[PDB]
Amino acid sequence: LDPRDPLLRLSNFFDDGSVELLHERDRSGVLAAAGTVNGVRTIAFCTDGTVMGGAMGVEGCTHIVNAYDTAIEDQSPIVGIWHSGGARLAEGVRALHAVGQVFEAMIRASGYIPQISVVVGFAAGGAAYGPALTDVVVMAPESKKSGVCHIVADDELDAYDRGRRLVGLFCQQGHFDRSKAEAGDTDIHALLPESSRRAYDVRPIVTAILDADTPFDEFQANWAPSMVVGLGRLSGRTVGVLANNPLRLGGCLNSESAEKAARFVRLCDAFGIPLVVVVDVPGYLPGVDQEWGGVVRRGAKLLHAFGECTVPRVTLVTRKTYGGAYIAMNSRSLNATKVFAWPDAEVAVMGAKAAVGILHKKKLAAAPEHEREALHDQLAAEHERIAGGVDSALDIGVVDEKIDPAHTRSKLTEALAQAPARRG
Amino acid sequence: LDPRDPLLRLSNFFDDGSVELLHERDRSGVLAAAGTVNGVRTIAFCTDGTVMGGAMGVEGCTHIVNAYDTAIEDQSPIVGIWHSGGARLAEGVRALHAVGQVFEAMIRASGYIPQISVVVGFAAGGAAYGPALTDVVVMAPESRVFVSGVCHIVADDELDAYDRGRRLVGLFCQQGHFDRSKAEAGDTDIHALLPESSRRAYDVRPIVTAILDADTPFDEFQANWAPSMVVGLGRLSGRTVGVLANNPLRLGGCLNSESAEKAARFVRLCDAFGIPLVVVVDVPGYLPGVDQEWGGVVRRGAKLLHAFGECTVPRVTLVTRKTYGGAYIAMNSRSLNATKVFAWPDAEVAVMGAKAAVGILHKKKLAAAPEHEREALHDQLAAEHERIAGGVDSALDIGVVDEKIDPAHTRSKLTEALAQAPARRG
Numbered sequence A: 001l002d003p004r005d006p007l008l009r010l011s012n013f014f015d016d017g018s019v020e021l022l023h024e025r026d027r028s029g030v031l032a033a034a035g036t037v038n039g040v041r042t043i044a045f046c047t048d049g050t051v052m053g054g055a056m057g058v059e060g061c062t063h064i065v066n067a068y069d070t071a072i073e074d075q076s077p078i079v080g081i082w083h084s085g086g087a088r089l090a091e092g093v094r095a096l097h098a099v100g101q102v103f104e105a106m107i108r109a110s111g112y113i114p115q116i117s118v119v120v121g122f123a124a125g126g127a128a129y130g131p132a133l134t135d136v137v138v139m140a141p142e143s144k145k146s147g148v149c150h151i152v153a154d155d156e157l158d159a160y161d162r163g164r165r166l167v168g169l170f171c172q173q174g175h176f177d178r179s180k181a182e183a184g185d186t187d188i189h190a191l192l193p194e195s196s197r198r199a200y201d202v203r204p205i206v207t208a209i210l211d212a213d214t215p216f217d218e219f220q221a222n223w224a225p226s227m228v229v230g231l232g233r234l235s236g237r238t239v240g241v242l243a244n245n246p247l248r249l250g251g252c253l254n255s256e257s258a259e260k261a262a263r264f265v266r267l268c269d270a271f272g273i274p275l276v277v278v279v280d281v282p283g284y285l286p287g288v289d290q291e292w293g294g295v296v297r298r299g300a301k302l303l304h305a306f307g308e309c310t311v312p313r314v315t316l317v318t319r320k321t322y323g324g325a326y327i328a329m330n331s332r333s334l335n336a337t338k339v340f341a342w343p344d345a346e347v348a349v350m351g352a353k354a355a356v357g358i359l360h361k362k363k364l365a366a367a368p369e370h371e372r373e374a375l376h377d378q379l380a381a382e383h384e385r386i387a388g389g390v391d392s393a394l395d396i397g398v399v400d401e402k403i404d405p406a407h408t409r410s411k412l413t414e415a416l417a418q419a420p421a422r423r424g
Numbered sequence B: 001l002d003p004r005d006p007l008l009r010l011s012n013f014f015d016d017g018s019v020e021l022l023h024e025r026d027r028s029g030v031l032a033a034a035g036t037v038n039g040v041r042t043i044a045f046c047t048d049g050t051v052m053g054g055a056m057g058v059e060g061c062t063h064i065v066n067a068y069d070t071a072i073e074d075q076s077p078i079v080g081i082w083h084s085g086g087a088r089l090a091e092g093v094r095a096l097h098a099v100g101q102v103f104e105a106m107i108r109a110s111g112y113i114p115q116i117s118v119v120v121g122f123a124a125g126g127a128a129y130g131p132a133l134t135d136v137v138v139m140a141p142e143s144r145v146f147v148s149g150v151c152h153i154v155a156d157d158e159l160d161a162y163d164r165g166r167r168l169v170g171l172f173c174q175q176g177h178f179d180r181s182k183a184e185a186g187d188t189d190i191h192a193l194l195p196e197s198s199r200r201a202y203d204v205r206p207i208v209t210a211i212l213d214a215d216t217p218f219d220e221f222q223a224n225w226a227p228s229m230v231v232g233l234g235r236l237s238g239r240t241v242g243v244l245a246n247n248p249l250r251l252g253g254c255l256n257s258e259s260a261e262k263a264a265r266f267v268r269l270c271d272a273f274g275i276p277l278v279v280v281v282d283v284p285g286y287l288p289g290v291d292q293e294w295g296g297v298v299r300r301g302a303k304l305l306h307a308f309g310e311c312t313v314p315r316v317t318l319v320t321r322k323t324y325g326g327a328y329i330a331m332n333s334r335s336l337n338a339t340k341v342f343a344w345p346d347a348e349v350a351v352m353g354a355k356a357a358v359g360i361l362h363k364k365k366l367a368a369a370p371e372h373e374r375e376a377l378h379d380q381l382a383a384e385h386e387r388i389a390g391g392v393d394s395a396l397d398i399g400v401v402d403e404k405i406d407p408a409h410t411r412s413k414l415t416e417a418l419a420q421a422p423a424r425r426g
């Protein structure tokens, strides 16, 4: 068969021998089907790249809409395998309208059933907006639109495998299992640099926290890189992770990392996936020539996302959480389920020397020039004696517990396990 | 510091004699009061610019939250007057936590009661995100937000800021009803404001204001941001309506990242508060970013589809001149469950212009033509593509346009369809 054969692609994605067409095969450029993905009933449609390059027409779209109606009624996940130049120019507005009805089915399914898009060939026009309306997009390299794609696979068959694993993360979420959690505990603090000033890649820490025998499905890895988000499993339970990555921009929030984080929070809240929020944030950055508009609009959306969130969400402060960004990274004010901190963590408005410079500016300015840098250094010292660390914040109430890093998984798992499935 | 006194500001804004303080005055930096705005019971709080520059502390933030809880429980609009350089640094993390509680309260009220911000002085850090979380932000010229599209309305001065803020309380909380007799009394040949040439640009805003009531302001939002897309509140036979209109005077009226994002916010906002939408469409395509980045238009284009698709208030579409391709779908089309779709008689509903389509469907019949005749061949080929495609008559057949209307009854036909649709469903 041709590699682009739709029934070939539906068969590679589904469990062997499980495919069951939902309509007679034809020249419409779409084939839809019921199958299983590791036992889960799944609906899937494939565009037929062999007919008119997969251009969508009235009858192809009517198959997709029917497949959505089938999947909405079964409460089944629906997977779309995409390879299409867009709408069929010759069918005119009728095809435009039918493509519109595809979007309207995707909007109806939104947050109801999970929707995965596996993009395996050229995808343009209505065939780029289609996937943009689903929850997760997997793109085979065989296919400039930054932020739109979530997971880049190695190739067409690797794309079907990540797509299969997404189905299992969304419809086979599991229970937290306190006993596996403690079997996996390690000293995650060891992965930190000995200098609090040195930068590091936070992904090893995300990898330490999550189960050893399961991949970490990082979303949008190359877009907004000061922020890491993705799905994984924590003691067998599907969890969503969000983590400032101090290797990029010093781990600060900005307009794009706020958007990446906020869209992910909303996605997990929609399907009941609890969140682990690993925090190491020194502040936030503006735009390209100093425009705060994006970080204000996008940062508000991030607040809104955590604010309205209703799944368990637990925060772990590894090193430092400063100022306005402290609030946005799932803080107590915004109803975080629990807030943990590693023993050496700092919860402050800014650095101690930066904060003394402002708080005692008049004092500092009145002092002789041959004693300022000496008084500033010492003023900063008594400042950290009363502020800065976990002990201050524990007393205020914004950190619930100082935890030994060797017990991060247990503490996180236990905190997640006693929240309700909803309300926060 | 008289100019900036909270109780003076709180009363230049409320109805004369209505201010009832919610707590006893102090030096916290916030005064919160009850009162009325043209009769509507309203809560309001003012940061105290004459105390530490209005810097926000634990006890001023608690006033704002109790103000929010009062307004939420009374189902009353809550107006914030902002002048503050940020959180009190001497209060440390206690104040960060208290600022966040203000945010959380603004998020609880979201969609539920209207929230209007009047930014009268500088507003930075914590006091910049406050307004960012509310529904409409008014800004007087003697101020700024710092730490664009963040600010919806620019005022002529502080007293004008309070005046525009008071109209907004009245637009959200005194929505009125439609009136067939008033609507017809306002009909005009709206088609006459177009240019006679089908490719000239025009400012859409005289069209909009000729649909809305003849002497009621049109409170445009974000006019200098994403200017290929006009949105705002006005009144239509006396009922509050929201308007979205493509503006052919900027970027040919196309959609792009900012215009899609502009429309999607505004649609979700009218939907939350029960405000019908009038979508005036004249859109020929959509455009990528400066470096040919389509990521913006895709993500934010999709959010527009989602806004209209999930929308439940009556939303009527009028095709003035042309509507093309993917932008046609997103601009409140039948496929997204528009309440009703009207077109003026000359309008075009097509995948693309006839010459564009014929250039693709017949790339090879034209490339093979002799150069001096390949054009007569293009124009005759296009003329027969539009004996079939593009017109309002074809679109009525397909069923994507519900009625072709005389432009002289635009206002009364839009009113009628909004009035007779269910208040929810769609």
Ligand SMILES: O=C(O)Cc1ccc(Oc2cnc3cc(Cl)ccc3n2)cc1
Pocket: A085, A086, A087, A088, A096, A099, A124, A125, A126, A127, A129, B255, B256, B260, B286, B297, B300, B301, B302, B304, B305, B325, B326, B327, B329, B330
């Ligand atoms: O497939 C083709 O050749 C024609 C085509 C192109 C795109 C499209 O879908 C959409 C969806 N949403 C959109 C939002 C915006 Cl703001 C702008 C454009 C949008 N276009 C449907 C059909």
Ligand SMILES: O=C(O)Cc1ccc(Oc2cnc3cc(Cl)ccc3n2)cc1
Pocket: A253, A254, A258, A284, A295, A298, A299, A300, A302, A303, A323, A324, A325, A327, A328, B085, B086, B087, B088, B096, B099, B124, B125, B126, B127, B129
């Ligand atoms: O008041 C001061 O002087 C310090 C201050 C500054 C900002 C702030 O509030 C917020 C809210 N949301 C935010 C979202 C992002 Cl993504 C980044 C920063 C954010 N900051 C609270 C306090």
